[PDB]
Amino acid sequence: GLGYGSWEIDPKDLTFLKELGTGQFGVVKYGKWRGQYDVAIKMIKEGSMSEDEFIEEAKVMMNLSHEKLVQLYGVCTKQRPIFIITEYMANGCLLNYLREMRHRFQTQQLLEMCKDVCEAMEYLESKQFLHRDLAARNCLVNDQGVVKVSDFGLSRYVLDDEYTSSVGSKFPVRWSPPEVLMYSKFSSKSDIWAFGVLMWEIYSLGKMPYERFTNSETAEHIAQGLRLYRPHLASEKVYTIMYSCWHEKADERPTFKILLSNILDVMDEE
Ligand SMILES: *CCC(=O)N[C@H]1CCC[C@H]1NC(=O)c1sc2nccc3c2c1NC(=O)N3c1cnc(CC(C)C)cc1C
């Protein structure tokens, strides 16, 4: 209506129903939009985000739409704190979901989670949009068990320097390729590397990558050409796919289109 652009949600249209917890940007709630539609609401804690830059980018993100990508519905910007409104993912983040042993996953289900994420990443790649921080902690699970990619691109607007450079105590070292750690060279191939680590997290049921190492030791391990190794639940064919994401030379890593074909082949063969 009057006063709200196409990227802007009227917060008065929101009904807050349940607090989901607190993340890095702040509190996340479950609610309804105009009484009928499930939504997630992330309340951006003040001082945490580059808000004017994020809002301009939110206008571009409104045009990103894919079955396996968490849908941005809009932002609430007239106020502090601002809200990010999205489709609701009832089973929470993939990381905690993988760690609940009660699910007793079949490997067929684990590969489907990889395929879910890979389709979303191929879509983002087809739009020349880097995620820049892909990890199981960022993927979400809906009430049907479908995995979708979330938080895409948001690291660009984080003001806490501990998060934004490899020198920082909160940088995702364990998801980063050597050229990121050594030179800060981000590209589609640093998303590819992180996807390989995500595949490892999935088949490891949510273990920390390099769980016996510090970040500093992980960087040295990776820099010397050493890698994660095969999770007990990964077949040889599955391990070949995730390992292909970790070529020291970025240009020898596959695209998300090639990974998708490889994953579909293994689904057929297994
Ligand atoms: C393992 C990670 C974890 O523990 N997360 C916790 C942070 C607060 C409580 C936990 N979060 C959630 O359970 C959920 S459920 C859900 N559904 C939809 C969206 C989200 C969501 C969360 N947390 C979220 O942060 N989001 C969310 C993600 N990404 C964006 C950005 C846009 C462009 C997609 C927005 C939201 C609301």
UniProtKB/Swiss-Prot annotation:
The chain holds residues 389 to 658 of 659 of the full protein. Changing residue 201 to G: In XLA; moderate; interferes with substrate binding. Changing residue 133 to H: In XLA; severe. Changing residue 132 to Q: In XLA; severe; prevents activation due to absence of contact between the catalytic loop and the regulatory phosphorylated residue. Signal peptide: none annotated. Part of a complex composed of EEIG1, TNFRSF11A/RANK, PLCG2, GAB2, TEC and BTK; complex formation increases in the presence of TNFSF11/RANKL. Binds GTF2I through the PH domain. Interacts with SH3BP5 via the SH3 domain. Interacts with IBTK via its PH domain. Interacts with ARID3A, CAV1, FASLG, PIN1, TLR8 and TLR9. Interacts with MPL/TPOR. Dasatinib binds at residues 86-89. Residues 14-267 form the Protein kinase domain. The modification Phosphotyrosine is found at residues 163, 229. This is Tyrosine-protein kinase BTK. It is found in: Cytoplasm; Cell membrane; Nucleus; Membrane raft. Non-receptor tyrosine kinase indispensable for B lymphocyte development, differentiation and signaling. Binding of antigen to the B-cell antigen receptor (BCR) triggers signaling that ultimately leads to B-cell activation. After BCR engagement and activation at the plasma membrane, phosphorylates PLCG2 at several sites, igniting the downstream signaling pathway through calcium mobilization, followed by activation of the protein kinase C (PKC) family members. PLCG2 phosphorylation is performed in close cooperation with the adapter protein B-cell linker protein BLNK. Changing residue 225 to D: In XLA; mild; interferes with substrate binding and/or domain interactions.
